[model samples]
Target chain A: GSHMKKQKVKTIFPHTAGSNKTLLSFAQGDVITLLIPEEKDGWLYGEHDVSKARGWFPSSYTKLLEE
Target chain B: LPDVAQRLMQHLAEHGIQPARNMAEHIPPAPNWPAPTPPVQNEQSRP
Candidate 1:
């Protein structure tokens, strides 16, 4: 059940409770998509939608427009 | 990209945006969010 795959920066920080430090989420072959309305800081955020989970991400770790 | 994230957070912090709450509220507003195909929850619940 693979959909369109793209490159997007993953937020290092997890939204989970307690420890609030950013960490890398996407490694090689991670699917992602670009999101609009960039923040004032100029970082383009994206989203990752897997079968069991989904999360937001920054645009720094992303590679760009993957298959 | 730790430097970048830190800078972004710093900017937001200077603008009075709390980092903790900012992370929670900084979610991208996807047009297709809450897709009808799956009928998932529209809004996130912090429980």
Candidate 2:
């Protein structure tokens, strides 16, 4: 996306295929605030606001807010 | 709201065809993204 920050989990994802750092899983409704937007090999680092977990997650797991 | 996606989904159900996977992923991330005028996307510089 041409965007970042405050992304919503459009679908549930649990990525065990972690790389560059740990992975953050989330329910379909989970939301996250981006710690950084550096994407490498399909992983993007972020922090889940609800669980307070900071890690690198799959880029496919999240997207910008609909509004 | 377009909701066209939902309508098509209902149509698929009417035909008894099981969608292979989640349809939301089919919607590309670009179309709905709201890139603001000032351009603060990839970690902006704040005063």
For this target, which candidate reaches the highest lDDT against the unseen true structure?
A: 2
Cα lDDT tens digits, model 2, A3-62, are: 335544443444442333355656655777665545565656666766677655666755
Clashing pairs in 2: none
TM-score of candidate 1 relative to the true fold: 0.30
Chain A TM-score values, per prediction: 0.38, 0.62
CAPRI level of candidate 2 = incorrect
Q: Write the per-residue lDDT of candidate 1 for residues A1-67, one digit (tens) a residue.
A: 2333344443333322123232114444565555444432334444565532344343443445435
Candidate 2 has a DockQ of: 0.01
Lowest-sum lDDT 10-residue window in model 1 chain A: A15-24
- Candidate 1 lDDT, tens digit per residue, B1-47? 76898678678767787655334324433322221111225777797
lDDT of 2 by residue, B1-47 (tens): 58887788788888777566633211112212221122225866879
lDDT, model 2: 0.53
